[PDB]
């Protein structure tokens, strides 16, 4: 508000208002609205008396501009812009000279043409309202009352104005402009500041019943009311209370730094129990592909026809048999569902019009497999109270499982190169700046070392499967739709290729929220005998569906071909999480580039040609029974991508906490390795926080073993 009243008014009026407040005893920084009101009143008073003069004879003139002619009276007296005592003396002098009557209250100006005093009032509210009290306060003491408004209104005694149209119009225009500017700046809160006639209130905010009573119960003890607390706080000096309280405090409250030495850490304690089992949405290293070299003709197309063409390339189907039962469900339903899928795919090739989507018949097999069997109904508690078994939904601690070797082999496979491409990124503008060249070098090397990677296959597989699931759930909210698992890649010699991994049968996907589960049955081809690691396949029913003729230089071998069938469930947040799996490439590139930048900041040079193009350099990226194994930069990039993909793929709340705590442990270890004399305050508590989230997850339990190996090798 101060900026407005200082920028909108000339320095003379600002100084006069400052003197007026000094005489009245107020602070302009605090009472901004009073300052603005005083400045407006003074400015209007000055505009009232300007260019107006008394002619030598009984006449008045409005000659403007410089008038050195003299001999003309000013026609008015300035009384507002003067001290109280000086203003009173001037008023008395002019009254005696003209024999007028001294007003009961101080006047504002004195008209010379007509020998009467005049009082100007600039109101921010209704003009007639303001005039009412202005006249009530000023009784008799005949004095003209002229009132302006911030809206262009106006009112004068007996409607007898004492100015020409052009000057009152100028005053009204100035007030209108000031009001418009205050409105534009949001400073038009002085509308209510005029709570009394010719007065500017502070801004009243009060605490009364139900807030004074609530304010007398929300303050430290030994204090009766908020006013007493305010009085105590107002009078308070640092007498040394902290020192006395620390003196009185018990010495048992301390932060003793226990040194963190090379021999203090201990390996993390992993759970012991039945081995952990696979939990991914789709098979990762056991997935088998039925591939067709799509004759170019790129453009997506209809996935169902691609799946049918992939199916038609395989001869070797046999009578399905259950080689590994699920041990928790009706096993014959699984192979019956597989047989139904085969039968429906065959029927599709005998219809008048080829569907673009297939809605499966709701058979009892698929009504049980997809959990369509009536789930517990939503009764009211007041009617089901007497059931004798009513506990809470969870009512159980998680089962403890021990790390198995299958997850490590899965990760080892996720870091390997494939024969296909799995990613084709678009072009960008040609590099023109040296930093652009450096960035392009980094990105091109990373992409070259990563495009033909298994983790990229997993990324594309998840993206495609989750996209199909989301589309089917949105457009088939009541049908048991069949959703092929399809991906597309580019062989070494071009030749785009479409791969079929299996099928998904979706359930009744009436998903209102983002956390509602849609159930489905996933049936994926594989060549892996389930009887080698049965514990891994604890959630699957594995059938033996066919025989696949693989090629060897010597001849054609005949391996068995199994189908891994399991009932799973996913919500829309999980579908979106899967669809957004291409960000794993971004995360891995961010990590590699962050390492390059960190090492470039040291040595004050671009450390990009020493990561790539330096075949001599290697990073420790594995462990063998002899010791720590090294690898090239490409293998490091692939390993980081695989780690990111698995994090996005085995996401769990036990991984987020484990990473956070193991990060602190790793930072302590690094501080030890840097000879920085690290120290902890409660290392046992940190270890407990790390281990409280090692329960059953395979990925987290493997990360814990990785950390144990790192601890073993680093502090050596």
């Amino acid at each position: 508000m101060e900026d407005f009243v200082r920028q909108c008014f000339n320095p003379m009026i600002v100084e006069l208002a400052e003197k007026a407040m000094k005489e009245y005893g107020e602070d302009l920084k605090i009472e901004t609205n009073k300052f603005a009101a005083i400045c407006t009143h003074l400015e209007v008073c000055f505009m009232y008396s300007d260019f107006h003069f008394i002619n030598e004879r009984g006449e008045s003139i409005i000659v403007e501009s410089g008038d050195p002619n003299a001999l003309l009276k000013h026609r008015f007296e300035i009384i507002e812009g003067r001290d109280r005592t000086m203003a009173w003396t001037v008023v008395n002098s002019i009254c005696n000279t003209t024999g007028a009557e001294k007003p009961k209250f101080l006047p504002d100006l004195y008209d010379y043409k007509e020998n009467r005093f005049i009082e100007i009032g600039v109101t921010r509210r209704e003009v007639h309202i303001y005039y009412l009290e202005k006249a009530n306060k000023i009784k008799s003491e005949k004095t003209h009352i002229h009132i302006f408004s911030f809206t262009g209104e106006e009112m004068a005694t007996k409607a007898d104005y004492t100015l020409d149209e052009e000057s009152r119009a100028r005053i009204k225009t100035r007030l209108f402009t000031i009001r418009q500017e205050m409105a534009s700046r949001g400073l038009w809160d002085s509308f209510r500041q005029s709570e009394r006639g010719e007065e500017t209130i502070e801004e009243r905010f009060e605490i009364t019943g139900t807030m004074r009573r609530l304010a007398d119960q929300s303050l430290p003890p030994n204090f009766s009311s908020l006013e007493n607390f305010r009085a105590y706080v107002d009078g308070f000096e640092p007498n040394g209370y902290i020192e006395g309280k620390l003196s009185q405090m018990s010495k048992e409250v301390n932060a003793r730094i226990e040194p963190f030495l090379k021999t203090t850490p201990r390996p993390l304690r992993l759970p012991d129990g039945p081995p952990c089992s696979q939990r991914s949405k789709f098979l990762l290293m056991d997935a088998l592909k039925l591939s067709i070299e799509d004759p170019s003709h790129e453009g997506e197309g209809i996935p169902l026809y691609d799946a049918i063409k992939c199916m038609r390339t395989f001869f070797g189907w046999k009578e399905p048999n259950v080689v590994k039962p699920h041990e928790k469900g009706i096993n014959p339903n699984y192979l019956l569902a597989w047989k139904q899928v085969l039968a429906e795919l065959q029927d599709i090739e005998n219809e008048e019009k080829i569907p673009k989507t297939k809605n499966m018949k709701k058979t009892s097999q698929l009504k049980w497999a997809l959990g369509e069997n009536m789930a517990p109904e939503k009764v009211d508690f007041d009617d089901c109270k007497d059931v004798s078994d009513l506990k809470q939904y969870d009512s159980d601690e998680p089962e403890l499982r021990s790390l198995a070797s299958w997850i490590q082999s899965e990760f080892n496979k996720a870091c390997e190169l494939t024969d296909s491409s799995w990613i084709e990124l678009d072009e960008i503008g040609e590099d023109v700046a040296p930093i652009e060249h450096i960035a392009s070098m980094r990105r091109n090397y990373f992409t070259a070392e990563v495009s033909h990677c298994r983790a990229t296959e997993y990324i594309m597989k998840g993206v495609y499967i989750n996209t199909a699931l989301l589309n089917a759930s949105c457009a088939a909210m009541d049908d048991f739709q069949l959703i092929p698992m399809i991906s597309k890649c580019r062989t070494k010699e071009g030749r785009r290729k479409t791969n079929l991994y299996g099928f998904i049968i979706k359930g009744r996907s009436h998903l209102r929220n983002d956390t509602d589960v849609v159930n489905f049955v996933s049936m994926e081809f594989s060549l892996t005998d389930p009887r080698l690691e049965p514990h891994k396949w604890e959630k699957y029913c594995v059938l033996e569906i066919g025989d696949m003729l693989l090629r060897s230089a010597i001849g054609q071998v005949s391996r068995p071909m199994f189908l891994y069938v399991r009932t799973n469930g996913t919500s829309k947040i999980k579908m979106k999480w899967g669809m957004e799996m291409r960000r794993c490439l971004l995360q891995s590139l961010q990590q590699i580039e962050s390492m390059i930048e960190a090492e470039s900041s040291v040595k004050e040079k671009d450390m990009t040609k020493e990561f790539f193009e330096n075949k001599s350099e290697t990073w420790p990226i594995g462990e063998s029974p002899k010791g720590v194994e090294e690898g090239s930069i490409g293998k490091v990039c692939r390993t980081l991508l695989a780690k990111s993909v698995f994090n996005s793929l085995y996401a769990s709340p036990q991984l987020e906490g484990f990473s956070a705590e193991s990060r602190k442990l790793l930072l302590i270890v690094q501080a030890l390795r840097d000879n920085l004399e690290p120290g902890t305050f409660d290392l046992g508590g940190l270890y407990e926080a790390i281990e409280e989230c090692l329960i059953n997850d395979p990925w987290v339990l493997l990360n814990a073993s990785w950390f144990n190996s790192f601890l073993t090798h680093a502090l050596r």
Partner: protein, 289 residues
């Protein structure tokens, strides 16, 4: 007729009549912020789904006369108005053609960046551990001769001439920038709102705090993703009328006027005009001065 009918329909009720008969024009920005909220749960997926189907876009009825109902290959472009992106491509392909002579004047701010980057010189890139200083840099360098308020008045005199307001309608002298901008944008058809936004970007200065290690000329702040990074610095050199208010509306002085009918009123006579975005005021050409 349409907007007045809608106003009458809105005041037919009582709650929406009280919202209109009480809230002054000043308290409109406050009322305009009472939206509902959370109308975009997943905009990317919705956009993809809408593009999957045909006729995702909406257009004016005039489409039916300009773009043929069917493509050269037989693909339908529009239908009963709903339109397909094939129609957008068709318009960009062989639609009506006009003269793009006003674009380099309305979007001059964007075409100055292109000419500064095109002729810029690139030096070597130095990798070090420099420290960034939090300076107060100018994102948009405003006109030297115009402040923020003077630039807003230039905009409201060039884009919305009939809603200027009292300050812009009683000021004695009109800036030359306004005259040249009016002359340049005389036959512009881009859009009033877009013209105003681009003029604000060109004229109004904008300042903010950035951690910049180097120049702050506001020609080095546009290229900052490019010049400086986490541990490197890229050396770069960019290329290169008077009225007086008398009071409220008076019925004795005839009907109200716009701010474009004041140019023919008279010299020294009274008339009531609609200024700003609201109240009608009685004014007169300044007889004096």
């Amino acid at each position: 007729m349409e907007r007045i009918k809608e106003l009458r329909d809105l005041m037919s009720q009582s709650r929406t009549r009280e919202i209109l008969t009480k809230t002054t024009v000043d308290h409109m920005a406050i009322i305009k912020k009472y939206t509902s909220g959370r109308q975009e749960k997943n905009p990317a997926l919705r956009m993809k789904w809408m593009m999957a189907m045909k006729y995702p876009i909406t257009a004016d009825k005039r489409i039916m006369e300009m773009i043929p109902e069917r493509n050269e290959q037989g693909q339908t472009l529009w239908s009963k108005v709903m339109v397909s992106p094939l129609a957008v491509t068709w318009w960009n392909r062989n639609g009506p053609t006009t003269s793009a002579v006003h674009y380099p004047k309305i979007y001059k701010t964007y075409f100055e960046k292109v000419e500064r980057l095109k002729h810029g010189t690139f030096g070597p890139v130095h990798f070090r551990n420099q420290v960034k200083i939090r300076r107060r840099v100018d994102i948009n360098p405003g006109h030297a001769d115009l402040s923020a308020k003077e630039a807003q008045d230039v905009i409201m005199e060039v884009v919305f001439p009939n809603e200027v307001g009292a300050r812009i309608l009683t000021s004695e002298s009109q800036l030359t920038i306004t005259k040249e901008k009016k002359e340049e944008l005389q036959d512009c058809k881009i859009s009033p709102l877009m013209v105003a936004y681009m003029l604000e970007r060109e004229l109004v200065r904008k300042t903010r705090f950035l951690p910049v290690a180097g120049g702050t000329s506001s020609v080095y702040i546009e290229v900052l993703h490019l010049t400086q990074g986490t541990c490197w610095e890229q050396m770069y050199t960019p290329g290169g009328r008077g009225f007086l208010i008398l009071g409220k509306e008076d019925r004795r002085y005839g009907p109200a006027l716009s701010i474009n009918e004041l140019s023919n009123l008279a010299k020294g006579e009274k008339a009531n005009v609609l200024i700003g975005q609201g109240d009608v005021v009685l004014v007169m050409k300044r007889k004096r001065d």
